[PDB]
Amino acid sequence: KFPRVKNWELGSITYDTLCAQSQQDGPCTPRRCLGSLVLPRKPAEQLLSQARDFINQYYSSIKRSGSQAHEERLQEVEAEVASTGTYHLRESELVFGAKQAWRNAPRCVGRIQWGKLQVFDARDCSSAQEMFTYICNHIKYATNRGNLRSAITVFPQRAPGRGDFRIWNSQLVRYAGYRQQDGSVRGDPANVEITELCIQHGWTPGNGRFDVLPLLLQAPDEAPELFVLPPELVLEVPLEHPTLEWFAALGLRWYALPAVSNMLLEIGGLEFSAAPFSGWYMSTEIGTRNLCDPHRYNILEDVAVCMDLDTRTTSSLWKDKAAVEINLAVLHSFQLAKVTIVDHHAATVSFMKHLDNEQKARGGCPADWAWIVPPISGSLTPVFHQEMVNYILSPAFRYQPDPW
Amino acid sequence: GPKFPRVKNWELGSITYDTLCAQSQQDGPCTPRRCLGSLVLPRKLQTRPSPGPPPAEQLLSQARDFINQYYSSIKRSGSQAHEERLQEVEAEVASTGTYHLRESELVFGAKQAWRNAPRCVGRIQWGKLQVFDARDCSSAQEMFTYICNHIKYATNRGNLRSAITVFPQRAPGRGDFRIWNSQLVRYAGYRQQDGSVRGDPANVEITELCIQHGWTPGNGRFDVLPLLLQAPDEAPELFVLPPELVLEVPLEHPTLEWFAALGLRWYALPAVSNMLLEIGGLEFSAAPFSGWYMSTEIGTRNLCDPHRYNILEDVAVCMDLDTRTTSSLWKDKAAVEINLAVLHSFQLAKVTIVDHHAATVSFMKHLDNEQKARGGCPADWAWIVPPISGSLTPVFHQEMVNYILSPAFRYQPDPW
Ligand code: HEM
Ligand code: HEM
Ligand SMILES: CN(C)Cc1cccc(OCc2ccc3ccc(N)nc3c2)c1
Ligand SMILES: CN(C)Cc1cccc(OCc2ccc3ccc(N)nc3c2)c1
Ligand SMILES: C[C@H](O)[C@H](O)[C@H]1CNc2nc(N)[nH]c(=O)c2N1
Ligand SMILES: C[C@H](O)[C@H](O)[C@H]1CNc2nc(N)[nH]c(=O)c2N1
Ligand SMILES: [Zn+2]
């Protein structure tokens, strides 16, 4: 019926009653579980039902359900949809909806912070140039000279028979990946495609490993336009290691601000195709995935050699030893630069506290175990031993197709 | 394109479709409304015994399916021998309520059970399983003899060999054969008056049952438990394994000389003894099986889990790490050195062990073999990805599809 959920380290049991509130299908069926898949394989009454549920969530949140303001707002939404096929959110509803979307995101380990989100209303944007200005202000606010603050900027919603507002880049700050025809990639191989799009739209490329990409910004039914971010706006952290003096010589660095810009924000049936949001990094994202993934910067063997490890055999655990030191260098370097960062132990501990808050608040918390457990030191963190239930609640952040 | 799950490897960018899941005839725990993939023991993965024999319709359909699988495996599907075996099973069930497997069917069935196990990273080895037929066993003393022979064969003085020994199946109006212990080799867990546990806290309940049944307990951290063996409709009997049969490896570290002084050790043979082997509707409640260890099982889980031996802080203190702050990564540093000690010690002792990198690399090869052979491979990502260094292994970047195929190894309730 409702899932019984166990923590194997503590022996404690909870029951998730919240999942009964999900109205959207995931990929699993009783025949087979597709929980480890990264992406999904793929009128008026529906919109109105999603709108009413959301308006109901909103008036409940301010302890005013059943108030006359509640009923009048439901009548406004209904009148707008019945007449125009769509409707519009008040700013206060948008703020609430953006926070709920973060709270509802099953793959985010940072949700203890969900109530602390600066929401920028950019819905009065009519051009790519205007989008750029809003983006620069977001970056400035969020960066805050290294004292990072979570934020989201919301551009105009999707509308019928009109193109979307889109940011083509997957994050506001990304490093170029240049495909040298002799196979290799200089820079970040995750970004080869976006890099080439930038060049063919007129960007003069560099040839470095850490060249910050310009933004491709698209207003409805227009070709995207190219915008170089003012270098003063892009905070970056040089990587050094507390005891290995040679580490600094690797020339490694990463940017301070993780700002995802290609997700769709869905609130009350309305869809915001451009709504970039930013937090701060957990160290393993940079140290383990971005730097050590074989299909990313792939620096493991380089670091292992500098540590004089036996690279000839798996059983020497050279990969494990190198990864630890790289992760240590990330933490040390961000701490030395006074740039906000969280290690995976601290993060997972705060997530356990979040699960407990949410059990009391809502009777559950949607969580994707495969994403919540960090990519190194899995069972050394408390989340590994915690059973989790994954389901989709709205408001939500969703994936959407690339605009090209 | 095709109406089957599309499965991507994000490291290589390669795509497959699992068509094998179309053969599953048993629901897992997930629904479109919520995924329960991370649950260790959801009710859908549980079983329970029946006193009265199963509805013959239910048994016959499972039996027919398995006979069909067997005759397909030997390339004789549709043959006269295939039809005659089907008629034979149906008549057997008609007169007796159950049926019995030929020796070659049992061998095929046991191997297919392992091949089908979604939580096993060691399945590249599935075709090399020594199947010991112990279906003639009629006493706890005889079960003990078979178990000792299994242990001697499988241990092979450190050159470990995969093996399973199958005791008589569940039968209408007769008690089960059961091994009460969860593995053939386990360390005792003694609850102390302060509330803590000396030994393996995983084994507190089984330790206390052994004591209740007449075992005189030790008081060490690595005391090997006796076996509680149960023949049909009898109280379990207590058997002590002769010490020379139980191969153990003392743990040392290749460079940290003090590590040996910690007095740690682990046993060579991982031999699970409490799972149910189901083949064609027949239930083998006692069918212990053994392979060899992957190092993270010992070094990360058994030694470092907070609810197991929990040695992380002790090792980190010895390495003079800062244990007062998360960002020093002391847990990560200590864990690597413990895992290295396990690998080094087993290699020095010439006892088979596989590191987690080598194991996951071999599992990727298994996935490719199985894509060609069967059109897929049921796999539980949470269990296949190792408990340290996850994304440093190739399996982390491979999407997987999890589903239940039979023959199968299944969980069953404790006999007490
Ligand atoms: C404040 C500090 C934050 C931390 C430490 C954090 C941490 C993380 C991590 C480690 C992941 C997995 C990322 C990956 O492996 O690529 C993640 C995913 C995610 N985060 Fe958070 N996050 C934070 C803030 C935010 C904010 C402000 C939002 C939105 C308002 C957000 C929404 C999401 C979403 C939707 C995902 C899933 C992305 C996907 O499915 O691809 N996070 N977060
Ligand atoms: C040959 C070397 C083998 C290796 C390296 C290996 C490796 C592993 C590992 C690491 C696990 C996860 C266990 C845990 O985390 O507790 C596992 C699970 C499992 N293995 Fe294998 N295994 C091997 C042989 C076998 C054999 C011979 C069988 C049966 C014939 C088998 C059947 C299973 C089953 C049924 C599970 C799931 C257990 C559960 O769900 O609790 N394995 N294996
Ligand atoms: C499917 N994804 C891997 C694609 C992708 C591309 C670019 C970035 C990305 O990150 C997801 C994400 C989202 C929000 C985050 C918030 C804070 C944070 N530290 N990391 C985050 C990471 C994910
Ligand atoms: C659900 N589990 C935690 C219960 C349990 C208790 C005792 C042992 C156990 O291990 C599972 C298992 C099964 C077969 C294996 C084969 C080889 C191997 N190296 N490890 C295995 C590990 C699992
Ligand atoms: C195939 C697998 O689902 C994929 O590699 C997932 C695993 N877990 C993850 N967890 C996080 N946080 N981020 C990821 O990109 C992934 N990738
Ligand atoms: C809660 C979670 O499912 C549990 O801790 C799982 C995770 N993955 C695992 N993976 C393996 N191989 N063995 C385990 O016991 C577990 N435990
Ligand atoms: Zn699932």
Short mmCIF file of C-alpha atoms in Angstrom, two decimals, chain A residues 17-295:
data_model
loop_
_atom_site.label_atom_id
_atom_site.label_comp_id
_atom_site.label_asym_id
_atom_site.label_seq_id
_atom_site.Cartn_x
_atom_site.Cartn_y
_atom_site.Cartn_z
CA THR A 17 2.29 8.52 2.77
CA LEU A 18 3.34 11.48 0.63
CA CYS A 19 3.79 9.38 -2.53
CA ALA A 20 0.01 8.92 -2.68
CA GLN A 21 -0.01 12.59 -3.78
CA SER A 22 1.91 11.91 -7.00
CA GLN A 23 -0.12 12.40 -10.17
CA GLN A 24 2.73 11.83 -12.64
CA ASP A 25 4.12 8.48 -13.88
CA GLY A 26 7.76 7.43 -13.52
CA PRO A 27 9.46 4.85 -15.80
CA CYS A 28 9.09 1.73 -13.60
CA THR A 29 6.37 -0.93 -13.87
CA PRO A 30 5.86 -4.14 -11.84
CA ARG A 31 7.55 -6.11 -14.68
CA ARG A 32 10.79 -4.06 -14.50
CA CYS A 33 12.51 -1.24 -12.59
CA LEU A 34 14.16 1.55 -14.62
CA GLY A 35 15.20 3.52 -11.55
CA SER A 36 18.81 3.77 -12.77
CA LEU A 37 17.92 5.45 -16.09
CA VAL A 38 19.13 9.09 -16.32
CA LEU A 39 16.53 10.47 -18.78
CA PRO A 40 12.87 9.69 -19.60
CA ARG A 41 12.42 7.55 -22.75
CA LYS A 42 10.35 10.45 -24.13
CA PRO A 43 -6.01 20.62 -22.72
CA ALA A 44 -8.18 22.94 -20.60
CA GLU A 45 -9.52 20.55 -17.95
CA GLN A 46 -6.05 19.09 -17.36
CA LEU A 47 -4.49 22.56 -17.04
CA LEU A 48 -7.33 23.65 -14.79
CA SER A 49 -6.89 20.62 -12.50
CA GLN A 50 -3.14 21.27 -12.18
CA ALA A 51 -3.83 24.97 -11.57
CA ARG A 52 -6.39 24.37 -8.81
CA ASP A 53 -4.10 21.86 -7.03
CA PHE A 54 -1.31 24.39 -7.10
CA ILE A 55 -3.48 27.30 -5.93
CA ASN A 56 -4.71 25.01 -3.15
CA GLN A 57 -1.09 24.22 -2.18
CA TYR A 58 -0.36 27.95 -2.10
CA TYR A 59 -3.28 28.99 0.14
CA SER A 60 -2.57 26.07 2.43
CA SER A 61 1.05 27.22 2.76
CA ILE A 62 0.01 30.67 4.08
CA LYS A 63 -2.62 29.13 6.37
CA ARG A 64 -5.54 30.63 4.44
CA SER A 65 -7.25 27.63 2.80
CA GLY A 66 -10.96 28.25 2.40
CA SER A 67 -10.52 32.00 2.77
CA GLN A 68 -12.42 34.24 0.38
CA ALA A 69 -9.12 35.26 -1.19
CA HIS A 70 -8.57 31.57 -1.90
CA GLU A 71 -11.94 31.15 -3.58
CA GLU A 72 -11.59 34.38 -5.57
CA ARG A 73 -8.16 33.34 -6.84
CA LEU A 74 -9.55 29.98 -7.99
CA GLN A 75 -12.29 31.90 -9.83
CA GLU A 76 -9.71 34.20 -11.46
CA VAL A 77 -7.63 31.26 -12.73
CA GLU A 78 -10.74 29.50 -14.02
CA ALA A 79 -11.97 32.62 -15.83
CA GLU A 80 -8.57 33.17 -17.46
CA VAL A 81 -8.21 29.54 -18.63
CA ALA A 82 -11.82 29.37 -19.85
CA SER A 83 -11.26 32.51 -21.91
CA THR A 84 -7.63 32.30 -23.05
CA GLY A 85 -6.57 28.65 -22.57
CA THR A 86 -3.88 29.67 -20.07
CA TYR A 87 -3.32 31.84 -16.98
CA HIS A 88 -0.66 33.77 -15.10
CA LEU A 89 0.90 33.52 -11.64
CA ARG A 90 1.12 36.28 -9.07
CA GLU A 91 4.70 36.95 -7.98
CA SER A 92 4.07 35.49 -4.51
CA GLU A 93 2.74 32.27 -6.09
CA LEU A 94 5.77 32.04 -8.33
CA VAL A 95 8.10 32.41 -5.35
CA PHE A 96 6.28 29.64 -3.46
CA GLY A 97 6.23 27.42 -6.55
CA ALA A 98 9.95 27.73 -7.24
CA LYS A 99 10.81 26.75 -3.66
CA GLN A 100 8.38 23.80 -3.83
CA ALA A 101 10.00 22.63 -7.05
CA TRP A 102 13.37 22.55 -5.33
CA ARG A 103 11.87 20.83 -2.28
CA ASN A 104 10.33 18.23 -4.59
CA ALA A 105 13.50 17.45 -6.61
CA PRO A 106 14.31 13.79 -5.88
CA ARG A 107 17.93 13.95 -7.14
CA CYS A 108 19.01 16.95 -5.02
CA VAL A 109 21.03 16.24 -1.82
CA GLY A 110 21.02 19.95 -0.92
CA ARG A 111 17.35 20.30 -0.08
CA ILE A 112 17.82 21.18 3.59
CA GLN A 113 18.29 24.67 2.10
CA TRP A 114 15.00 24.68 0.15
CA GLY A 115 13.27 27.48 2.05
CA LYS A 116 16.20 29.83 1.41
CA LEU A 117 15.98 30.71 -2.27
CA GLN A 118 16.12 34.16 -3.82
CA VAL A 119 13.54 34.24 -6.62
CA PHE A 120 14.00 36.81 -9.41
CA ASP A 121 10.92 37.50 -11.54
CA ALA A 122 12.18 38.04 -15.10
CA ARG A 123 8.82 37.52 -16.77
CA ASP A 124 8.84 41.06 -18.24
CA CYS A 125 11.69 40.10 -20.54
CA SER A 126 11.12 40.63 -24.29
CA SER A 127 14.56 40.10 -25.88
CA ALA A 128 17.80 38.12 -25.69
CA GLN A 129 19.64 41.30 -24.69
CA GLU A 130 17.26 41.69 -21.74
CA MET A 131 17.79 38.03 -20.76
CA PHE A 132 21.54 38.69 -20.64
CA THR A 133 21.09 41.59 -18.23
CA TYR A 134 18.93 39.45 -15.94
CA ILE A 135 21.50 36.65 -16.09
CA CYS A 136 24.39 38.94 -15.15
CA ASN A 137 22.44 40.26 -12.16
CA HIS A 138 21.64 36.67 -11.08
CA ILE A 139 25.31 35.69 -11.31
CA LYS A 140 26.40 38.78 -9.35
CA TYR A 141 23.81 38.14 -6.63
CA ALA A 142 24.44 34.42 -6.38
CA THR A 143 28.23 34.74 -6.36
CA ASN A 144 28.37 37.44 -3.67
CA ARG A 145 32.17 37.49 -3.64
CA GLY A 146 32.38 33.82 -2.66
CA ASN A 147 29.63 33.81 -0.05
CA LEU A 148 27.27 31.95 -2.38
CA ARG A 149 23.50 32.43 -2.14
CA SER A 150 20.96 30.17 -3.84
CA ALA A 151 18.86 31.88 -6.50
CA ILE A 152 16.59 31.36 -9.49
CA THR A 153 15.61 33.76 -12.28
CA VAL A 154 12.32 32.98 -14.02
CA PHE A 155 11.87 34.05 -17.66
CA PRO A 156 8.45 34.18 -19.46
CA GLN A 157 6.41 30.98 -19.55
CA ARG A 158 5.79 28.86 -22.64
CA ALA A 159 2.77 29.94 -24.70
CA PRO A 160 0.75 28.10 -27.41
CA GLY A 161 1.94 28.54 -31.01
CA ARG A 162 4.93 30.65 -29.97
CA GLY A 163 8.57 29.60 -29.60
CA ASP A 164 10.17 29.27 -26.16
CA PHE A 165 12.57 31.53 -24.32
CA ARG A 166 15.67 29.28 -23.96
CA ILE A 167 19.19 29.37 -22.67
CA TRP A 168 21.08 26.99 -24.95
CA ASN A 169 23.93 26.41 -22.48
CA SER A 170 23.39 23.65 -19.89
CA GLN A 171 24.92 25.84 -17.18
CA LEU A 172 25.59 29.56 -17.03
CA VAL A 173 29.30 28.79 -16.57
CA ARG A 174 30.82 25.97 -18.64
CA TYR A 175 34.30 25.35 -20.01
CA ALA A 176 34.79 24.90 -23.77
CA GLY A 177 35.62 21.53 -25.27
CA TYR A 178 37.59 21.73 -28.50
CA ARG A 179 37.71 18.58 -30.62
CA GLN A 180 41.23 18.27 -32.06
CA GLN A 181 40.58 16.13 -35.17
CA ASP A 182 43.23 13.66 -33.97
CA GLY A 183 40.62 12.17 -31.62
CA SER A 184 41.21 14.02 -28.36
CA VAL A 185 39.26 16.87 -26.80
CA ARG A 186 40.94 19.89 -25.26
CA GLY A 187 38.85 21.19 -22.37
CA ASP A 188 35.56 19.66 -21.18
CA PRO A 189 34.33 16.86 -23.49
CA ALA A 190 30.86 17.29 -22.02
CA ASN A 191 30.71 20.62 -23.90
CA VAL A 192 31.93 19.83 -27.42
CA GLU A 193 28.49 20.33 -28.97
CA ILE A 194 27.62 23.64 -27.27
CA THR A 195 31.17 24.86 -28.02
CA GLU A 196 30.77 24.22 -31.74
CA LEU A 197 27.37 25.94 -31.79
CA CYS A 198 28.99 28.99 -30.19
CA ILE A 199 31.75 29.13 -32.81
CA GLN A 200 29.35 28.79 -35.73
CA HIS A 201 27.25 31.59 -34.26
CA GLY A 202 30.33 33.83 -34.40
CA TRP A 203 32.34 33.23 -31.23
CA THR A 204 36.10 33.45 -31.60
CA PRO A 205 37.34 30.38 -29.64
CA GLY A 206 40.40 30.02 -27.43
CA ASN A 207 42.56 26.90 -27.17
CA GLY A 208 42.77 26.42 -23.42
CA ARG A 209 41.55 23.67 -21.09
CA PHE A 210 39.43 26.09 -19.07
CA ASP A 211 38.00 28.67 -21.49
CA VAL A 212 34.68 30.01 -20.19
CA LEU A 213 31.98 29.76 -22.86
CA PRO A 214 29.75 32.64 -24.03
CA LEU A 215 25.98 32.30 -23.58
CA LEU A 216 23.59 31.46 -26.42
CA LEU A 217 20.28 33.14 -25.56
CA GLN A 218 17.10 32.64 -27.54
CA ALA A 219 13.97 34.81 -27.50
CA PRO A 220 10.85 33.26 -29.13
CA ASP A 221 11.16 32.37 -32.82
CA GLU A 222 14.52 34.15 -33.19
CA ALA A 223 17.94 32.66 -33.77
CA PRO A 224 19.93 32.63 -30.52
CA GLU A 225 22.29 35.54 -29.82
CA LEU A 226 25.81 35.33 -28.41
CA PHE A 227 26.85 37.05 -25.17
CA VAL A 228 30.30 36.99 -23.55
CA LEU A 229 30.16 37.04 -19.75
CA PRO A 230 32.24 39.86 -18.20
CA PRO A 231 35.27 38.00 -16.76
CA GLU A 232 34.92 39.88 -13.45
CA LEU A 233 31.53 38.16 -12.99
CA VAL A 234 32.94 34.65 -13.27
CA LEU A 235 34.60 33.61 -10.02
CA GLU A 236 37.01 30.69 -10.38
CA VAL A 237 39.12 28.77 -7.85
CA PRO A 238 42.67 27.61 -8.65
CA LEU A 239 43.22 24.08 -7.28
CA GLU A 240 46.10 23.43 -4.89
CA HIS A 241 46.69 20.66 -2.36
CA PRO A 242 47.50 21.27 1.32
CA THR A 243 50.55 18.95 1.38
CA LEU A 244 51.36 18.02 -2.24
CA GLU A 245 53.16 21.09 -3.55
CA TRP A 246 53.17 19.73 -7.14
CA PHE A 247 49.37 19.68 -7.35
CA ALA A 248 49.18 23.41 -8.08
CA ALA A 249 51.43 22.75 -11.09
CA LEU A 250 48.65 20.74 -12.75
CA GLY A 251 47.05 24.10 -13.66
CA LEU A 252 43.63 22.86 -12.55
CA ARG A 253 40.72 25.13 -11.60
CA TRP A 254 36.96 25.22 -11.38
CA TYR A 255 34.26 27.88 -11.28
CA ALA A 256 32.47 28.76 -8.06
CA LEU A 257 28.88 28.84 -9.28
CA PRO A 258 26.89 25.74 -10.32
CA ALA A 259 24.07 27.35 -12.32
CA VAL A 260 21.90 24.93 -14.28
CA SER A 261 20.12 26.70 -17.13
CA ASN A 262 18.48 24.08 -19.35
CA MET A 263 15.81 22.63 -17.05
CA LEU A 264 12.08 23.32 -17.31
CA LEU A 265 10.26 24.65 -14.23
CA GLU A 266 6.65 23.44 -14.02
CA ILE A 267 4.21 25.17 -11.64
CA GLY A 268 0.44 24.68 -11.69
CA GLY A 269 0.50 23.38 -15.25
CA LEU A 270 2.51 26.38 -16.47
CA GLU A 271 5.95 25.70 -17.94
CA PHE A 272 8.96 27.97 -17.66
CA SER A 273 11.48 26.86 -20.30
CA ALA A 274 14.12 29.30 -19.10
CA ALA A 275 14.56 29.43 -15.34
CA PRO A 276 18.24 29.13 -14.45
CA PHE A 277 19.00 28.34 -10.83
CA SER A 278 22.17 28.15 -8.77
CA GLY A 279 23.38 26.85 -5.42
CA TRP A 280 26.86 25.96 -4.32
CA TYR A 281 28.96 22.90 -5.14
CA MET A 282 29.36 19.71 -3.19
CA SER A 283 33.03 18.80 -3.54
CA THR A 284 32.55 15.40 -5.25
CA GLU A 285 30.80 17.03 -8.25
CA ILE A 286 34.04 18.79 -9.11
CA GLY A 287 36.64 16.47 -7.62
CA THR A 288 35.15 13.13 -8.56
CA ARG A 289 32.81 13.59 -11.51
CA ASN A 290 33.99 16.68 -13.44
CA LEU A 291 37.69 16.01 -12.97
CA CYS A 292 37.88 12.19 -12.78
CA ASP A 293 35.10 10.79 -15.02
CA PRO A 294 36.76 8.98 -17.94
CA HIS A 295 34.57 10.97 -20.35
#
